[PDB]
Amino acid sequence: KHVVLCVSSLKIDLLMDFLNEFYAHPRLQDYYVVILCPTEMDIQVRRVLQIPLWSQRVIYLQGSALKDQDLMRAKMDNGEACFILSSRNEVDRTAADHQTILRAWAVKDFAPNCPLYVQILKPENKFHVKFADHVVCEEECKYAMLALNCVCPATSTLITLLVHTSRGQEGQESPEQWQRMYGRCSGNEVYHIRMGDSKFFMEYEGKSFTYAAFHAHKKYGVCLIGIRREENKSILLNPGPRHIMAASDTCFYINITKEENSYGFKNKLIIVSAETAGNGLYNFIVPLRAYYRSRKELNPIVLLLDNKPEHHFLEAICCFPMVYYMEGTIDNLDSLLQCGIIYADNLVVVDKESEEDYMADAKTIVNVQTMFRLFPSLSIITELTHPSNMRFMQFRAKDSYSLALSKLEKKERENGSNLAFMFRLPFAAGRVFSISMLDTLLYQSFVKDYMITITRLLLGLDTTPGSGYLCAMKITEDDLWIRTYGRLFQKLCSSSAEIPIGIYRTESHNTLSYVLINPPPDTRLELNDIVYLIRSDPLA
Amino acid sequence: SAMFNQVLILICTLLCLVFTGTCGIQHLERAGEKLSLFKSFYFCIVTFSTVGYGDVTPKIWPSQLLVVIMICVALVVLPLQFEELVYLWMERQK
């Protein structure tokens, strides 16, 4: 029962969250977790192997992936799972790639049976391991998520909390009202039922895709997403109202628990900064002006980099309408003013710098913070690495909520630790997001094969012809013709085909924020609020 | 497995010494004052354990020396192997 994991440089982080994440599964816990690394253990991490619980469930060994001897040493053939991982923080982005993909070969070579899981930084290199079971592609998803953050707010936090397992352990703390409800719906998760019948499957065999998600909210509060035909094993998002269900067809759905167990311009502008251009941003821009998107509401976008745009970028981006070049980092008031940050709306920054660990995320925290104070009417987004530092973001001399959050997060991390990082103000605002937070996706994938593919289709990225786009709709005074969320759901999908998932809320102390995923459909709605719906009409 | 190897060497040596001790006391005291083998085992393991009760000991010119010689050799030989065992424990840690 030996599980394999390989990495170039371990750190408390990657390990920890893996571990804490990995044994979160009741089903598969007992395994020997195998660690392969060239360099010695640090004085910190080597301390977490000595703890009474993780001692004999974790095997650590010194060695590489290339030599055949040390592969033997791990008992690969016997081993039930093989994981390769990439270091995040490094001097060279382009080299790390080589390291990984290489490892992939050697492992595949050695034992071409076992599943194979791996991470890849640059999109360009995706092409090389297409042969592997499952592959998580960093940049494409990074830029994608953050990109969709410019249509609806807090795109990020939504997805993250989806892919994180919890019991609703965190909703019972009863400090307050919102948070009570906020955390409650955290444990919320996506699940797999297809086969036979169960509490939810039979209800409608013969009616459409739509009528299913209606009366699923009535009995249980489950809301399905998409049906894989048994034919091509292609996944669909929100099949149109024309599609039908069978007795054997795939149901993907969300619930809190598994079914079995219970030059001047016009519109708002957006400004992006990054270290270097790459095949990365080509995909940043895809979701912005797509097909489904209108030519009225487009958001012309300005690119601000440190280094001059490279040649390929030019041939790559000249297709689209509406973008330009401006240069300089985010330091100078002036370098930002030339662009019209004032006229503009949302701020996008993705940066980094090549001793202590969490620290290396500093260079950005700072540049940003200033902006919080320069423009109180302004909204911004950000990317760190270490999912510890989050709350260190937008902080005020005196806040009762913002400071009193500390005690609440500790009070979670001490009972049991999965998500310590939810409650924090800016995080729930979507103003914050991180890299290794989606990394969880990979670990969890081992138990769920529909977990990765589902994601891309949500964003942008992969479209097999039947599919749908994730869109949002503000709530206003004529929608208040509707009382609540359930009364909404049933008058919503009786006109067009759209399914809701979560919601969004705001109160005062500018102002605060929320995301509630699949709330019981009894819950009310204010004036300023937002909901995440899926709309598919590319194809009739 | 080096740990294993020296564990073996320790055991081997101990066994050897015990054997030499039995065989040592066997032919000598069997003359002047007769002693059973178990008495020998006792003495040997009483010598290498550094206990030294003294119920029965050599009273004869050569008999003491022989025991003594074996001990002196042993006392040098003893740590050589403990020293060895230590060396590996250091390797295992590394």
Q: Which domains does chain A have, with CATH numbers?
A: 2-132 (3.40.50.720), 146-163+263-441 (3.40.50.720), 189-255+463-535 (no CATH)
The coordinates were experimentally obtained by cryo-EM
Sign of the dihedral through C-alpha A401, A406, A409, A412: negative
Written as one letter, the residue type at A418 is N
Give residue A513's identity as a one-letter amino acid code. Answer: S
Tokens of A340: 């019209």
Q: Among A120, A99, A142, which Cα is nearest to A275's?
A: A142
Task: Compute the distance between CA of residue A417 and CA of residue A419 in angstroms, rounded to an integer.
Answer: 6
Report CA-CA distances (Å) from A101 to A110, A311, A394, A516, B4: 15, 26, 38, 38, 39
**What does the alpha-carbon distance between residue B43 and residue B53 come to, in Å, rounded to a whole number?**
9
Q: Are A461 and A437 in contact (CB under 8 A)?
A: no
**A98-to-A101, A203, A320, A435 alpha-carbon distances in Å:** 5, 51, 32, 20
What CATH number has the domain bearing residue B81? Answer: 1.10.287.70
Q: Rounded CA gap, A267 and A257, in Å?
A: 43
Write the single-letter amino acid at A57.
R
Per-residue tokens: A467:
């599919």
Q: Which two tokens stand for residue A47?
A: 């301390």
Q: Which two tokens stand for residue A477?
A: 């005074």
Q: For A481-505, b where at least 16 C-beta lie within 10 A, e where not — what string?
A: ebeebbebbeebbeeebbbbbbbbb
> How far apart, in Å, are the Cα atoms of A389 and each of A27, A166, A420?
32, 22, 11
d(CA A57, CA A40): 20
Place of tokens 């010119």: B61
Task: Name the residue among A433, A382, A418, A468 with its Cα closest to residue A17.
Answer: A418
**What token pair was written down for A374?**
């320069």
A533, β-bridge pairs: A471, A500
Rounded to whole angstroms, what are the CA distances from A186 to A104, A161, A413?
Answer: 35, 6, 15
Is A537 one of the annotated binding-site residues? no
Q: How far apart are CA A222 and CA A209, in angstroms?
A: 14
d(CA A202, CA A477): 38
A446 assigned binding-site residue: no
The data reach a resolution, in angstroms, of: 4.5
Is A357 annotated to bind a ligand? Reply is no
For residues A4 and A218, give the distance between their C-alpha atoms in angstroms, rounded to a whole number: 44
| Alpha-carbon distance values, B39 to A90, A310, B12, B59 (Å) | 71, 91, 21, 15
- Asked whether residue B51 is marked as a ligand-binding residue, the answer is yes
Asked whether the CA dihedral A470, A474, A479, A485 is positive or negative, the reply is: positive
Closest CA to A287 of A504, A456, A499, A531: A456
- Cβ burial of A411 (10 Å; 0-12, 13-18, 19+) is middle
- Report CA Rg, chain A: 24
Distance (Å, rounded) from C-alpha A540 to C-alpha A201?
26
Given a contact cutoff of 8 angstroms between Cβ atoms, the answer to whether A129 and A99 are in contact is: no
DSSP letters along A429-451, please? TTSEEESHHHHHHHHHHTT-TTH
Q: Is A37 helix (H, G, I), strand (E, B) or coil?
A: strand
A535 secondary structure, DSSP code: E
Contact A49, A55 (CB under 8 A): yes
Report the 10 Å Cβ neighbour count for A115. Answer: 14
Distance, CA of B28 to chain centre: 17
Between CA B34 and CA B37, with CA B36 as vertex, the angle to 5 degrees is 130
Number of domains comprising chain B: 1
Distance CA A383, CA A280 (A): 15
Q: Which residue, A524, A525, A523, A506, is CA-closest to A515?
A: A506
Q: Quick one: A219 exposed, middle or buried, by C-beta within 10 A (0-12, 13-18, 19+)?
A: exposed
What domain range is B56 assigned to?
Answer: 2-93
DSSP track, A228-270: --TTT----SS--TT-B--SSS-EEEEESS-TTT----SS--E
Return the number of other C-beta atoms located less than 10 Å from residue A165's C-beta.
Answer: 16
Nearest 5 degrees, angle CA A287-CA A379-CA A185?
75
Give the Å distances, CA to CA, from A148 to A106, A143, A286, A458, A481: 37, 9, 10, 10, 29
Alpha-carbon gap, residue A321 to A331, rounded angstroms = 28
Q: Which residue has the tokens 């689209």?
A: A320
Measured distance between the N- and C-terminal CA atoms of chain B, rounded to whole angstroms: 14
Contact A37, A10 (CB under 8 A): yes
List, in order, residues 6 or more apart from A347 with CB less than 8 Å away.
A270, A271, A341, A371, A378, A379, A380, A381
Residue A381: phi and psi, rounded to 5, are -140, 160
Please write down the HEC assignment for all residues of A123-189: HHHHHHCCCCCEEEEHHHHHHHHHHHCCCCCCHHHHHHHHCCCCCCCCCCCCCCCHHHHHHHCCCCE
* Cα dihedral A380, A16, A456, A179 sign: negative
A304 is in an annotated binding site: yes
Give the span between the Cα atoms of B29 and B60, in whole angstroms: 9
Q: How buried is residue A339: exposed, middle or buried, by Cβ count under 10 Å (0-12/13-18/19+)?
A: middle
